């Protein structure tokens, strides 16, 4: 089908369940890498109905730690915001429920702001294809393909 949480015809719903970080590109790329905060690998989503529970593991030399945050709905279409090194607020620009999701977020903090994207799949890997589709959407918001990380391969624990 695919659908925009920005658009009209979006069921939340319908991404609830089983997800894996496939890919994550930043603005900033030092929030990403080895020792980033950001370098989150998503497992579940939880759909609620004014909220998503999102859990996550995350690396530090080769230790995993578990990690749980609740994001609220704003009054945005489509967005939902959460308090995680600051202030986020996030979108879900592209998805076809069944296999990918695509996400876009705005981190707020110390009078700085940075974007980050990420590419998340149902299972492990995504096709090439696929990768490649985010990295066009990538561009488009100004993200090259230097700051672009794919850590299907790290994507374990
Ligand atoms: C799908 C996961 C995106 C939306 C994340 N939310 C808070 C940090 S990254």
Redo the contacts with the bound molecule.
């Keep these: 089908e695919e659908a925009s949480s920005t658009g009209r015809n979006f069921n939340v719903e319908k991404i609830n369940g089983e997800?894996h970080?496939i890919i994550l590109a930043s603005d900033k790329r030092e929030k990403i890498e080895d020792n980033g905060n950001?370098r989150?690998f998503?497992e579940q989503?939880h759909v609620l109905e004014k909220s998503?529970v999102?859990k996550?593991h995350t690396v530090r030399d080769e230790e995993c730690s578990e990690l749980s945050?609740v994001?609220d709905k704003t009054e945005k279409a489509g967005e939902?915001s959460?308090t995680?090194d600051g202030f986020?607020t996030?979108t879900?620009p592209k998805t076809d429920y069944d296999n990918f999701?695509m996400?876009?977020?705005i981190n707020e903090k110390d009078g700085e702001t940075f974007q980050?994207m990420?590419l998340?799949g149902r299972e492990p890997d995504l096709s090439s294809d696929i990768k490649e589709r985010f990295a066009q959407l990538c561009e488009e918001h100004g993200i090259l393909r230097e700051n672009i990380i794919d850590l299907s391969n790290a994507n374990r624990c």
């Design positions: 997800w970080t950001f989150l998503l989503i998503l999102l996550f945050m994001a939902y959460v995680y986020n996030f879900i999701l996400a876009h977020l980050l990420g998340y």
